[PDB]
Amino acid sequence: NDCPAPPPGSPDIRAIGYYTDAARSVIDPRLKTQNDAAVKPLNAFAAHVAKFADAYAKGADEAAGRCALTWLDAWARSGAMLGRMAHVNNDQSDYMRQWTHGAAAMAYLRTQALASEQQRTDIETWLKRLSAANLAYWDNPKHKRNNHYYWTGVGIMATAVATRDDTLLNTAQGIYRAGIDAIEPDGRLPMEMARKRLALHYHDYATAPLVLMAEMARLQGEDWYTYRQGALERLAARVADGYRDPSWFNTQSGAVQETATPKASSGWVEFYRLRSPDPMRFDAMHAAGPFQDPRMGGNLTLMAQEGIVPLPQQ
């Protein structure tokens, strides 16, 4: 078809933190606009490659799959996001590198069947270096391993599965199990409950990468859902309950939750619907779909029914 030109892939990222409160729940409107403008290439790259992967997954559109690889290869050859990370106000640049690597590795995992040998070495070396850089960021103990740590596993996991890297797979499993072990008996995640009016949003947002990592483990013949089975169900059930009634999150966080319907990354329910011992609790969240998130590989509603990786045409 017609593959659009990819934006430049700079090695450096200068994202700007836009929060004004200690709980990171009140947004500075100007810093948000400044950050959105500076990270627009990273978001545009993520949205396009997931869009191309979605079109390839529909079948009879290998051109779209090659277009995603064209975009991934261009950023791989320019060393995108492997340069200097800025630290304006907070570590927003490191977070964008984690999120954008996830989107890139998810797009590669879905379209890898069409990659040329040069594209394979370019992109996989790039995805492996991004994995090492994002992992090294967490060697500092001051960096709190909240949902940011869980989202880091997305890129590492998708790179591990796409390249059959056993050590990267074990690294991902360590991140996944760290999130599962952090769930309290009542189903809470303490660092997400500390977000006041966004406590429910960030319990939702922490579940998304954990579900996606467990779903990618199935591509490797492993059932990560059985690890400490019951904890993920309690967390996911609280999120579904919170969208019906936020009274639990109001009490435990000490703040009245914002009112917002499930969207984007909330589409982990499309996968988790299929695994829960009580799937009907997620009927209301499912009805709010379909769900799309480039940071999770694109159309979650379609991937939950068709599989994450389309079958390569013969």
Side-chain angles (χ1 to χ4, degrees), residues 1-23 25-57 59-76 78-143 145-195 197-243 245-262 264-314:
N1 210 342
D2 193 13
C3 187
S10 162
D12 296 358
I13 299 176
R14 191 176 186 279
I16 302 145
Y18 47 78
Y19 275 115
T20 62
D21 58 337
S25 72
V26 189
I27 296 145
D28 188 305
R30 212 199 170 229
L31 291 170
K32 183 79 163 93
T33 307
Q34 294 179 120
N35 172 68
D36 287 351
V39 309
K40 197 165 154 213
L42 304 162
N43 281 321
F45 183 86
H48 276 84
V49 298
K51 173 193 179 77
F52 303 150
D54 281 335
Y56 168 65
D61 196 352
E62 300 208 320
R66 304 193 290 271
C67 180
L69 300 158
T70 291
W71 279 48
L72 295 154
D73 186 75
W75 273 37
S78 80
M81 311 185 288
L82 286 177
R84 186 193 100 63
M85 306 289 94
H87 291 91
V88 192
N89 291 333
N90 78 339
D91 293 0
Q92 197 73 22
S93 299
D94 294 283
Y95 305 144
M96 281 316 267
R97 175 156 84 177
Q98 294 152 17
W99 285 321
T100 315
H101 169 224
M106 288 295 313
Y108 181 66
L109 174 74
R110 298 185 76 190
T111 64
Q112 184 184 34
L114 310 183
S116 77
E117 181 61 28
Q118 184 179 238
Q119 281 171 339
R120 276 166 203 276
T121 49
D122 286 344
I123 297 166
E124 289 175 18
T125 306
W126 177 58
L127 292 181
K128 285 190 178 189
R129 277 168 197 181
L130 285 168
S131 307
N134 285 321
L135 182 75
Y137 166 87
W138 295 108
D139 288 26
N140 194 338
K142 318 306 196 82
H143 297 148
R145 296 178 177 196
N146 62 348
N147 66 86
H148 285 305
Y149 187 60
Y150 312 156
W151 277 100
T152 300
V154 173
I156 298 178
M157 180 61 166
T159 306
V161 177
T163 71
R164 319 253 296 170
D165 199 315
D166 283 357
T167 79
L168 270 192
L169 181 89
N170 286 344
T171 292
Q173 192 173 32
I175 295 171
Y176 169 80
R177 289 181 173 194
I180 298 303
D181 291 339
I183 299 162
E184 295 290 335
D186 64 3
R188 89 171 56 202
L189 287 166
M191 274 168 314
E192 320 297 339
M193 195 66 84
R195 302 301 290 274
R197 77 185 300 259
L198 313 175
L200 158 66
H201 169 80
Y202 279 112
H203 278 76
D204 190 350
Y205 198 62
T207 308
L210 300 173
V211 169
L212 186 61
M213 289 191 54
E215 292 296 331
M216 291 197 270
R218 298 201 64 140
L219 311 165
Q220 299 293 98
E222 300 187 346
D223 191 354
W224 288 7
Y225 283 114
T226 70
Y227 173 75
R228 206 199 191 218
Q229 185 155 8
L232 182 56
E233 164 76 9
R234 286 165 195 177
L235 164 61
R238 294 287 198 181
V239 173
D241 292 344
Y243 280 113
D245 188 344
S247 57
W248 185 69
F249 283 99
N250 289 349
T251 303
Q252 309 305 323
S253 67
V256 174
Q257 302 301 289
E258 77 171 354
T259 312
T261 45
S265 53
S266 294
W268 59 259
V269 292
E270 306 292 88
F271 290 105
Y272 195 68
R273 266 177 96 229
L274 301 181
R275 327 287 189 211
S276 176
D278 183 20
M280 83 193 313
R281 196 194 295 271
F282 309 95
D283 285 349
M285 289 193 70
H286 172 63
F291 294 100
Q292 299 164 254
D293 190 355
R295 294 174 181 174
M296 294 169 68
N299 197 313
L300 305 161
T301 299
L302 291 187
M303 282 190 286
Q305 314 174 250
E306 305 172 346
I308 284 159
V309 184
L311 194 73
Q313 173 175 355
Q314 287 186 352

